Amino acid sequence: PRPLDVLNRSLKSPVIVRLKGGREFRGTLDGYDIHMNLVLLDAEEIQNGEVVRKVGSVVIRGDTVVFVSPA
Amino acid sequence: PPRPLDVLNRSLKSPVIVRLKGGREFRGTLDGYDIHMNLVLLDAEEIQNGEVVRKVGSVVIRGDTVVFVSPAP
Amino acid sequence: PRPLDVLNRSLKSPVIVRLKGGREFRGTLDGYDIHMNLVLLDAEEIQNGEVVRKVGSVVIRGDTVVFVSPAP
Amino acid sequence: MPPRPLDVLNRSLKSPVIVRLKGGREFRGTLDGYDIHMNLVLLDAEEIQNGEVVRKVGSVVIRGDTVVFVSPAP
Amino acid sequence: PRPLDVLNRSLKSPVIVRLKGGREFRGTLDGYDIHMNLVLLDAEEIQNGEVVRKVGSVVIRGDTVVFVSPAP
Amino acid sequence: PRPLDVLNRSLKSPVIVRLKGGREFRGTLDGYDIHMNLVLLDAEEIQNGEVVRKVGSVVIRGDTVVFVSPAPG
Amino acid sequence: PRPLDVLNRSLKSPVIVRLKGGREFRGTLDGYDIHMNLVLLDAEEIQNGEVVRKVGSVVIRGDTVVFVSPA
Numbered sequence A, G: 001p002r003p004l005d006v007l008n009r010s011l012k013s014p015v016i017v018r019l020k021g022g023r024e025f026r027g028t029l030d031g032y033d034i035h036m037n038l039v040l041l042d043a044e045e046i047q048n049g050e051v052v053r054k055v056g057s058v059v060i061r062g063d064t065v066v067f068v069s070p071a
Numbered sequence B: 001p002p003r004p005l006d007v008l009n010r011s012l013k014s015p016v017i018v019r020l021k022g023g024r025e026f027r028g029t030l031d032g033y034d035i036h037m038n039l040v041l042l043d044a045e046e047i048q049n050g051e052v053v054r055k056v057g058s059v060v061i062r063g064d065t066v067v068f069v070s071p072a073p
Numbered sequence C, E: 001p002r003p004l005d006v007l008n009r010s011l012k013s014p015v016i017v018r019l020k021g022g023r024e025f026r027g028t029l030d031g032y033d034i035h036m037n038l039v040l041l042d043a044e045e046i047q048n049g050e051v052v053r054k055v056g057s058v059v060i061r062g063d064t065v066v067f068v069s070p071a072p
Numbered sequence D: 001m002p003p004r005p006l007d008v009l010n011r012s013l014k015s016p017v018i019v020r021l022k023g024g025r026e027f028r029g030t031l032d033g034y035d036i037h038m039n040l041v042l043l044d045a046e047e048i049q050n051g052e053v054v055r056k057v058g059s060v061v062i063r064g065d066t067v068v069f070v071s072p073a074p
Numbered sequence F: 001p002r003p004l005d006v007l008n009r010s011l012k013s014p015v016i017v018r019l020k021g022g023r024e025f026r027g028t029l030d031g032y033d034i035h036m037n038l039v040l041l042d043a044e045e046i047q048n049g050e051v052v053r054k055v056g057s058v059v060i061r062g063d064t065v066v067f068v069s070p071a072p073g
């Protein structure tokens, strides 16, 4: 298929997003686009196992993503 | 289905926190934005892992610098 | 053979992907695209040539990739 | 219920501004112009590293790429 | 007198591909495209004189390449 | 598109260029182009304010530039 | 008065290429393109001032160039 297809197959389901530099985000994938900018709902920022803050929602720049996976 | 830029829009005039590469944060009112994700914040504060470094009437942030944007309160 | 061509010749077969900084993955190449983003089913993250974890599947930003090679 | 990023930049032509470059340094000068890329031109400006003035220049042309943020300095 | 041309005049011949970071690859140039992505057959990964891997073939993102040269 | 104009107003006049990282150049601006690649004549590589080496001319990649500023002195 | 024109005025002549990261290249400029990719003939990879390697020729990714100079 197309990687963007699998992304769409994950809408409304939980996911794990990895970022350059080390940090991770966990939550519900709401939307996305050709830049791979992502939108998460009810998410936690994670650094080396420990949470570093919760957020009602976030908009991440695709240019910061390494990979995304379902949980 | 809901898209990134859309959510930004749904947040114009309200307060937001902008993360940046390196670690410096910003808190202010999202005034505007363009397609390359540049941002415009009014009455914002630069945040150094905790404390406040500077306060500005307004600020024009390069999109290429942002890591994420989150609605505050 | 075109770079993108050789990749296609591997759809469904196992592969190893190496990202900038070390992180290596091992799984089935499900799909790809222009930019070179990749989708991998049933795969394991491997920085140190061993096994560090597993993930039903993953979508990788082509920007992150260094190389892709068929896992004999 | 207005703006755009490039607009606010225009709304500062001829006024003093603070420019934050990637790395750490900064520039303080009169915003003379800009463009799509977001390249900037500054007049009678100073380079500043962690507080100290490192050099004064008649004017400077800053590659958009280098910029982190621009703000009007009141 | 055309970087990509030189690359072409080496298909099927042995080459040295230097990546960013320090690592290297020695193998047979198979394919290539506009971006400068490469395809190598029967290659070995090299880090400061030592072989860290042998592979049937590899697809290298142009983005990673520092340089490519022929080896008699 | 005014920055590119300023560069033009300096063609043949001396200038100082700074590249991402730290290296600085001083010489006569000869040419330039959309991308911001530059051509300098009789230039010198610099640190701490003065001379460190010389080159009849150099072609810098716009991708490497941080800033250019006209400088007789 | 155009960068790419100066390169061309150096075809078949010795040049020095400085790449990000530190290392340099010395050799005869053979070719180049819009991406400023370069081709060198009979070149040496110099590091910290020591000849670190000789090659019959190299194709240097433009993206890795800092600057090119004659003589």
Ligand SMILES: O=c1ccn([C@@H]2O[C@H](CO)[C@@H](O)[C@H]2O)c(=O)[nH]1
Binding pocket: D037, D038, D039, D063, D064, D065, F033, F034, F035, F036, F062, F063
């Ligand atoms: O003179 C130029 C040419 C390009 N760019 C911008 O720099 C980036 C490429 O490094 C692109 O966003 C491009 O728009 C500039 O800032 N100035």
Ligand SMILES: O=c1ccn([C@@H]2O[C@H](CO)[C@@H](O)[C@H]2O)c(=O)[nH]1
Binding pocket: F035, F036, F037, F061, F062, F063, F064, G034, G035, G036, G062, G063
């Ligand atoms: O010869 C070139 C080609 C591109 N670029 C710049 O590098 C950016 C991305 O590498 C391009 O958008 C362009 O602004 C250069 O500096 N020199």
Ligand SMILES: O=c1ccn([C@@H]2O[C@H](CO)[C@@H](O)[C@H]2O)c(=O)[nH]1
Binding pocket: E034, E035, E036, E062, G035, G036, G037, G061, G062, G063, G064
């Ligand atoms: O074969 C290629 C393809 C792209 N680039 C340039 O390298 C940069 C990659 O970020 C971009 O400016 C692009 O124009 C090259 O140097 N060579």
